[PDB]
Design a protein around this ligand. Sequence first.
Ligand SMILES: CC(=O)SCCNC(=O)CCNC(=O)[C@H](O)C(C)(C)COP(=O)(O)OP(=O)(O)OC[C@H]1O[C@@H](n2cnc3c(N)ncnc32)[C@H](O)[C@@H]1OP(=O)(O)O
Ligand SMILES: CC(=O)SCCNC(=O)CCNC(=O)[C@H](O)C(C)(C)COP(=O)(O)OP(=O)(O)OC[C@H]1O[C@@H](n2cnc3c(N)ncnc32)[C@H](O)[C@@H]1OP(=O)(O)O
Ligand SMILES: CC1=C(CCOP(=O)(O)OP(=O)(O)O)S[C@H]([C@](O)(CCC(=O)O)P(=O)(O)O)N1Cc1cnc(C)nc1N
Ligand SMILES: CC1=C(CCOP(=O)(O)OP(=O)(O)O)S[C@H]([C@](O)(CCC(=O)O)P(=O)(O)O)N1Cc1cnc(C)nc1N
Ligand SMILES: [Mg+2]
Ligand SMILES: [Mg+2]
Lengths: 872, 872
Amino acid sequence: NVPYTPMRWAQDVPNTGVDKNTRVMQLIEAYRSRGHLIADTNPLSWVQPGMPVPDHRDLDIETHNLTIWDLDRTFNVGGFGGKETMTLREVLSRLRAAYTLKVGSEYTHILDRDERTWLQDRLEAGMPKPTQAEQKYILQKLNAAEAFENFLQTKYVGQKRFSLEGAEALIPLMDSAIDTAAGQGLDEVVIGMPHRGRLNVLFNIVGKPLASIFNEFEGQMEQGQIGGSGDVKYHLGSEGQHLQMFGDGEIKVSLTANPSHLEAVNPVMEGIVRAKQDYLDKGVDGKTVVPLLLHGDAAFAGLGIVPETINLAKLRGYDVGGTIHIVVNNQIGFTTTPDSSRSMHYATDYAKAFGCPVFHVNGDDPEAVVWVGQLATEYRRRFGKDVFIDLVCYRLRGHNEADDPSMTQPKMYELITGRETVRAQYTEDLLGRGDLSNEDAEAVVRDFHDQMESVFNEVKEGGKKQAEAQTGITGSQKLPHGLETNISREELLELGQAFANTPEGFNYHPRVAPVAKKRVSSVTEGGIDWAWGELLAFGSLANSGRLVRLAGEDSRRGTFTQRHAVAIDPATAEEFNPLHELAQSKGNNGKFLVYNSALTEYAGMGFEYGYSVGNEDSIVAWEAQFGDFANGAQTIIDEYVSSGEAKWGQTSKLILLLPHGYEGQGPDHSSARIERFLQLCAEGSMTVAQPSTPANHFHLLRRHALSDLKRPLVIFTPKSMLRNKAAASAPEDFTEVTKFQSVINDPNVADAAKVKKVMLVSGKLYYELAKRKEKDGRDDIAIVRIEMLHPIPFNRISEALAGYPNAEEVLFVQDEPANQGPWPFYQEHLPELIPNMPKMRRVSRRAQSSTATGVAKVHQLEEKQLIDEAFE
Amino acid sequence: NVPYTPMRWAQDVPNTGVDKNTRVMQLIEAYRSRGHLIADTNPLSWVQPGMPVPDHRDLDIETHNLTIWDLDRTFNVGGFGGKETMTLREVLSRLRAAYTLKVGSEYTHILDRDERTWLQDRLEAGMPKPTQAEQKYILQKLNAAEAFENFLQTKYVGQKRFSLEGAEALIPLMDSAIDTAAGQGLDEVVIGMPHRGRLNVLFNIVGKPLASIFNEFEGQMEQGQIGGSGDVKYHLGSEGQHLQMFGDGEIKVSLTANPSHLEAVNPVMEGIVRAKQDYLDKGVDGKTVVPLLLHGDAAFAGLGIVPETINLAKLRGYDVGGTIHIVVNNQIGFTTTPDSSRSMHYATDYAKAFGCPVFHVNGDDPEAVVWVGQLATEYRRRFGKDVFIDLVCYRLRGHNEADDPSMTQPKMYELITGRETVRAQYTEDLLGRGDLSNEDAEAVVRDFHDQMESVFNEVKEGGKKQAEAQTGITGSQKLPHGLETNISREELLELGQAFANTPEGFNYHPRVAPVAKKRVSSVTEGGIDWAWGELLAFGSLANSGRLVRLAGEDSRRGTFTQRHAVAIDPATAEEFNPLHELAQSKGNNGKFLVYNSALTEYAGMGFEYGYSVGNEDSIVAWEAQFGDFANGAQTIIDEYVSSGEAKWGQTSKLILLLPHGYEGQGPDHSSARIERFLQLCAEGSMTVAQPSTPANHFHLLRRHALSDLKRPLVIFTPKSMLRNKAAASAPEDFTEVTKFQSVINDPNVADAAKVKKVMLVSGKLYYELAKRKEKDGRDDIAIVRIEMLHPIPFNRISEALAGYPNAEEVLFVQDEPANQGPWPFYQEHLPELIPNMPKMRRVSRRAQSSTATGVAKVHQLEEKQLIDEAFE
Ligand SMILES: CC(=O)SCCNC(=O)CCNC(=O)[C@H](O)C(C)(C)COP(=O)(O)OP(=O)(O)OC[C@H]1O[C@@H](n2cnc3c(N)ncnc32)[C@H](O)[C@@H]1OP(=O)(O)O
Ligand SMILES: CC(=O)SCCNC(=O)CCNC(=O)[C@H](O)C(C)(C)COP(=O)(O)OP(=O)(O)OC[C@H]1O[C@@H](n2cnc3c(N)ncnc32)[C@H](O)[C@@H]1OP(=O)(O)O
Ligand SMILES: CC1=C(CCOP(=O)(O)OP(=O)(O)O)S[C@H]([C@](O)(CCC(=O)O)P(=O)(O)O)N1Cc1cnc(C)nc1N
Ligand SMILES: CC1=C(CCOP(=O)(O)OP(=O)(O)O)S[C@H]([C@](O)(CCC(=O)O)P(=O)(O)O)N1Cc1cnc(C)nc1N
Ligand SMILES: [Mg+2]
Ligand SMILES: [Mg+2]
């Protein structure tokens, strides 16, 4: 059992052509670059049959024209090993000690010279010898891991737990990293991980009490929100403290919640970290919250969210100072082996796309594992980049504890069954080297088992409760009754004047200057448009002293060239952000931050959700270029935004701004899928709205921000109505009107006793129907608008209908096809809530498989037909 | 304007320590590895302000301790340049000619020695000088590109076309690659691409007639399917032939359809290629259909589908012999620059994760572009791997032709406005070197313009038609009336006996052997379960002579350990596929292929959709581990599967198998979201079903396969009912019953005149209600099952209800919450279709924000409450 190729027999060759010193230097470079391909990193003696084996002919002395006859000759090595001269025997020895034992490293692809040299120096110095105290501490942690698993196996046989057996070195690795961070003087560590070994991490790393875990197994679950539904035990989070064992340091540790969908926690936990860093506010030399992110091998290589999130690491609005990644490589999926899971040689090969180091380490050598953890944390602190650790281990049982792995992997499980554990091997080693006594070794085991037995008995004394029905979360938060959302006239003029206080030598671009002038004049003359209404809202909130953050694709200028939140000087390329300046000059320390995102919907929306969870007192908004591209973030919508409160008791106030409208641009630029969002709504989970005037948009946003109802808000925003002159607002609407309106009654009804038809509408189609009514002089019709779709304002709708006593019909008019838009929701729910209402009649486009037509002439024909049908 | 750092002044150094020959060898290695960092590949003199600049101190002679005094001395270079000895002046010259001009290359990261040597030899030989005929051909192609764009600009000013101006070298690049493929003797080239320069490629590469394009601009659109909706002009496909200009070769060229959602065509076009290769059947040395895939720079780096699809390249069921990728790098998104779009240095850095070569080429040197195209196609044919080309160019106008790019990028568009085009520069060069006459140069322009003017006038003679309403696609395909789907008794016994004809020294695993025995005995005794019903269907179809393909996560064994389509011997690890063997021994050349996929839903389902389009006569099925994870492939469901026929006239017969059932495993293992699929259905777009017996599943699959209705099928499959003994089927049900049943009436009604309540149900809840009915001895109830959900079988439901004349109530019973499951669809549609039916009454779980509870005791309590409510 020796791992190297034996020395071969050959004749001595002459020192001609390429000199032999040159050849020895090439051998050194080869080992530094490709030595990991023959390192002792696999605990099993296993090669997967279907996988290609890389060429490693570069690592034998024959390929560099050297021979056994050169082993005792001396050569110039140019500072290798801190020496100017050396023999080939000593060169080989050192290279093999550094690059071919229990740690394999990839770092030569890095472009910066100082980085490379830092890593090179530390790897060739070697792992320092630990003290006896340190060694005993590692043994305690290994014991705790294995003991916990065995206890649960004994007391609860069939139950699903996803064990960590085969990979117990994870516990001392994570502990090493957290301990190093505490020594550096940082503030917090945030963890995200999957199912494998979660209960073990909760107990041994975070410090969740043992009584809680046992209760979970007996069927008593802790409640997150009153009347909540809940979730399985391996999807929950917690908080705790960590004290340094051989130091005076202390750090906070947290673990976040997540669904079954693998790798969906990656963008969410990045956002949490960024929000926490922003709150502490320590500048560029800060970055004092550390992200620690665990993965599995099959998921890491397969799912595309992983590289998508790593791509945000060095960008202006997303940087968090680097992430420490750990891949638990147990060499198997569920019943699938690496030959069917990836086309890369290693699972961690995405690192080479981003220019980051990789360390592969054997999971049966605990001292090496602890060293690698420390080295990774130090690299992050110095260089501020991502680092990747690959922990090579195995899975002792099946995927779960009810499965038989021999059916599909017979040969692999001949090697696994009947091995001795990592705890056993390490205990044997220490006793052998005289580093530990037998009395000590036995006490370590006995003490921990006594602790667990004690707690278990205490838990079983208390009787088991019986099941009870879950009520719901509808009334678990209060509504802001009697809150006023108007600003003063002084405040409105100051906001307007922010676009005139340009810096010293700044000028606007010729096509932007008219927009700025209109903003200064409108706050006293009238004609405020949609975009200026939105900015007035965010600006007012920033003045009061809040952190406002807006992010999305092309969101600084706007997709429709309407926002201009940051302006650029054509001559010098200087930037200017008016509202941020004004906020910072009022002494409440408010901020207005605007960012252009990368081209992602899954990672984009995920990051913003996380930001909302990490700072409860911030105002966050994500924008989509068109609302049609939001289906690329469906996982986030379904698993976090819509259902997080009911499952885990995690609350959020994220705002989604989704453009919407039927205007003839085709099937992927028309519909944000209102029907889909209205399906997800129940128990008052989130608010859904589609306002028709800038002032109403203003009032909706401000109500959300100033209330104490912590639930999301989804707004369907316009595209062509942005520049419609009939939709503009007057200043009195921002300063004298006090509240948001959920239903707006018809403002052009002469006599209410002559009305015989009522039309209900939502959004931009109002302005077409009103136009036609005026032209044809109809005094028997009344158009009523619905601004808030969910929850249903049935009291106001009832009040409006009651104002027209001679009405005979009610028409529901929408632009969308009959199987889309708000009609399906309303035809089901509204008749029950208003019993005395006449039967409703739909007027819309026909039902379709696609969203809209692709021909523009057909769109125009359809619209004419629709409005004609509405007016008999 | 010289691009190199000037030589510096210094003293001559002694030849001590590390020898100078060693230093010259290190300089050679540095240029081969990192020389691309200073190459002349950018047409503009532009450096983006916010982006980090890599260290390139490795490329100057000072860092290797050499000096101007070494330039004329001679050194040993070990075969570089085919010489044993050389001067430093000549070494620098050659290195700079190979790695620092108009082509920059990355290839040193490749692990195989033979690959590296092949590339190294060709790059250092250089680009061969082209003939005069070849040169004139390049000029014709450049002219065609620019001329086409200018014509459209003149005749249709405002209209959106997404121009290729700034990147016209794409046309000769694509032509070079296709021409090389024709010379190799291959069969077809399949193209997938986005919006940028699509109309140009359709005309100049594929050969779509010019009349068609002009008609599109005037509003007349070609119809795909009768009564279809359509799509915009830059989302369409076509077919054509390509003849070799200087050869006797000929090849077929195709371009596929796609939605606005970027990069969603990647898995689809890979599947198309694989299906076409499988049909030709030329073995391992074949792979004679070439995939050519175009991208944009922002999308390539940002979206996660890109690396997810590249990961399938070398896997057993997905390999297509390599893909040629072209990234059109115009150094801008919409209004977003690279500093805000990616954290990688180049856009093509994912290549280094997979071990593939990259070529960067200047878009203003057409001869270099043509060379790179040829070299890439040759590399693919020899090594069978992916290759990446980065074409560096610019965007002349704004994102579209109605946008002003100066507002956000002032300085960049000072360099762009008023340049001379690539056609102009190349014409000037050829006239300068005396390779072309002026008469020739003028004819090239005049002839093409005359051709375009001719066609345009012809198109405008014919009058413009007026718009007309679009009818729908419901009746555009026929239904299989009077088709019988039963097999003979001889056929059924043969299928059963396939599991007894094991190979020579093969034995089953002990826990699999009972399943095989039961399969042999059941085809005569009874008790056929769900899994055996499914396999009997696919097996029968394979025998008749069809290619049957099944793919999904853990689909060979099955998630619930139920399928065992391929078995493994514990002693030798040999594999056995019974049904494939039987099919191949019947002389119709049928196949049964089963594959375990990687852990992806987006790339997985996309690949199978593509396979169905590439071979219309195959049976394809994609399976999900649980139906809850299908929301990760929402883009494919919404943009291709549900709506492809209505938009482009592209038909498919894909089968989706999605597990479903409420059994107490929590919110991410319970619901496949039936309500969402039923929203998407309209115009008879696809079939949706939930059968309750194995024989019915058999008949449904066979009807789909043998009919001439080319639309998808979505089936909701069971989890616990797989092993329910009350659900098993007898052999007569496969051989004497002739058709699939859409409604199954109650088989335990003694007297029909005593029934006073009718219950409607679908799926596994039937077996609970029937159980209770028998226990309590209720003769006033009748339970009726609905097997096909869409389209609605209203004639059969009416017939069933008419059989109970004294019925007073109708109850709709489901397990799902009230805002989920089939209730929303049915409460809307069914009362209209059956006017005389009593009012329906729902019996279900309450409406919820999440899918299901997380506690198991609560699940049991809910189920009891539900069934009690049903029976008064
Ligand atoms: C969805 C959520 O996040 S909370 C929903 C919780 N409640 C329910 O779902 C109960 C069922 N729903 C209902 O009874 C109704 O739909 C209601 C009460 C929510 C609204 O019906 P109406 O009375 O017709 O609407 P109206 O606009 O008059 O609302 C009255 C008050 O509720 C407040 N309100 C209503 N919806 C919201 C909301 N989403 N956020 C904040 N305040 C709200 C209004 O500000 C108003 O306050 P006021 O006392 O100053 O007038
Ligand atoms: C969804 C698609 O891809 S095709 C749908 C096209 N047609 C429509 O949408 C029209 C509206 N729908 C309807 O009229 C009804 O729902 C129908 C006719 C489709 C079925 O209603 P019923 O008559 O109650 O159902 P029933 O099961 O008796 O169907 C009768 C025949 O239709 C055939 N059929 C019905 N649905 C399908 C289907 N999805 N695929 C194939 N054949 C079908 C049956 O095989 C049967 O053939 P038979 O004459 O040999 O017995
Ligand atoms: C395919 C799959 C698993 C295999 C993971 O392999 P690897 O990453 O190597 O991990 P490890 O097991 O080696 O540590 S676990 C898991 C599942 O969902 C796990 C349960 C859960 O995490 O909720 P299951 O119950 O269906 O098996 N599952 C189904 C699944 C599929 N696709 C997604 C996106 N998410 C999933 N949860
Ligand atoms: C963000 C975005 C575009 C920029 C692409 O930049 P790059 O990849 O560098 O290409 P190029 O333009 O430099 O060649 S084009 C496009 C859009 O949808 C294009 C239209 C279309 O392709 O259908 P739009 O009309 O909203 O701008 N769009 C919106 C968009 C967003 N997200 C997805 C998944 N798909 C999209 N179509
Ligand atoms: Mg694994
Ligand atoms: Mg671009």
